[PDB]
């Protein structure tokens, strides 16, 4: 800022950045469809696991 | 677009393939097979069965009883000679 001796905007853009210093929050939105994806995952996985654990000894 | 999932689709896959049909054939083929030559019924008698077991198995398998059967006709027809001429 003190490099520009003709400052005139640096307070403006500095308080503009400090204004938007709370930029935007993130997106932790998925907690319902993602658990359905891993629900189908655990479903078909335990189907496969029980079937192969049976058929190996079979 | 997401984590796609074919590692675990084995549970309903295991019908259509070719070793499945061979497997469901030969697991049925193996249980009722008798283990070590059991129940062969090596002793039997019906007043003519010891003739078969001594002569007409695959061990001896010789045609000499037919010889005896031929001898039986030599016992029969020659005696029929004694009955005819």
From Swiss-Prot, chain A:
Portion of the full sequence shown: 60 to 117 of 174
Quaternary structure note: F-type ATPases have 2 components, CF(1) - the catalytic core - and CF(0) - the membrane proton channel. In yeast, the dimeric form of ATP synthase consists of 17 polypeptides: alpha, beta, gamma, delta, epsilon, 4 (B), 5 (OSCP), 6 (A), 8, 9 (C), d, E (Tim11), f, g, h, i/j and k.
Name under which the protein is recorded: ATP synthase subunit d, mitochondrial
Function: Mitochondrial membrane ATP synthase (F(1)F(0) ATP synthase or Complex V) produces ATP from ADP in the presence of a proton gradient across the membrane which is generated by electron transport complexes of the respiratory chain. F-type ATPases consist of two structural domains, F(1) - containing the extramembraneous catalytic core, and F(0) - containing the membrane proton channel, linked together by a central stalk and a peripheral stalk. During catalysis, ATP synthesis in the catalytic domain of F(1) is coupled via a rotary mechanism of the central stalk subunits to proton translocation.
Note: Present with 6820 molecules/cell in log phase SD medium.
Annotated TM spans: none
Disulfide bonds: none
Sequence similarity: Belongs to the ATPase d subunit family.
Source organism of the structure: Saccharomyces cerevisiae (strain ATCC 204508 / S288c)
Subcellular location, record wording: Mitochondrion; Mitochondrion inner membrane
Coiled-coil intervals: none
UniProtKB/Swiss-Prot annotation, chain B:
Keyword ATP-binding: no
One GO CC term, this protein: mitochondrion
Note: Present with 14600 molecules/cell in log phase SD medium.
Keyword Transcription: no
Family: Belongs to the ATPase F chain family.
Keywords annotated in UniProt: ATP synthesis, CF(0), Hydrogen ion transport, Ion transport, Membrane, Mitochondrion, Mitochondrion inner membrane, Transit peptide, Transport
Assembly information from the UniProt record: F-type ATPases have 2 components, CF(1) - the catalytic core - and CF(0) - the membrane proton channel. In yeast, the dimeric form of ATP synthase consists of 17 polypeptides: alpha, beta, gamma, delta, epsilon, 4 (B), 5 (OSCP), 6 (A), 8, 9 (C), d, E (Tim11), f, g, h, i/j and k.
BP-aspect Gene Ontology terms: proton motive force-driven ATP synthesis; proton transmembrane transport
Source organism of the structure: Saccharomyces cerevisiae (strain ATCC 204508 / S288c) (Baker's yeast)
Gene encoding the protein: ATP17
Protein name: ATP synthase subunit f, mitochondrial
Its biological purpose: Mitochondrial membrane ATP synthase (F(1)F(0) ATP synthase or Complex V) produces ATP from ADP in the presence of a proton gradient across the membrane which is generated by electron transport complexes of the respiratory chain. F-type ATPases consist of two structural domains, F(1) - containing the extramembraneous catalytic core and F(0) - containing the membrane proton channel, linked together by a central stalk and a peripheral stalk. During catalysis, ATP synthesis in the catalytic domain of F(1) is coupled via a rotary mechanism of the central stalk subunits to proton translocation.
Superkingdom field: Eukaryota
Segment of the intact protein contained: 7 to 91 of 101
Protein location: Mitochondrion; Mitochondrion inner membrane
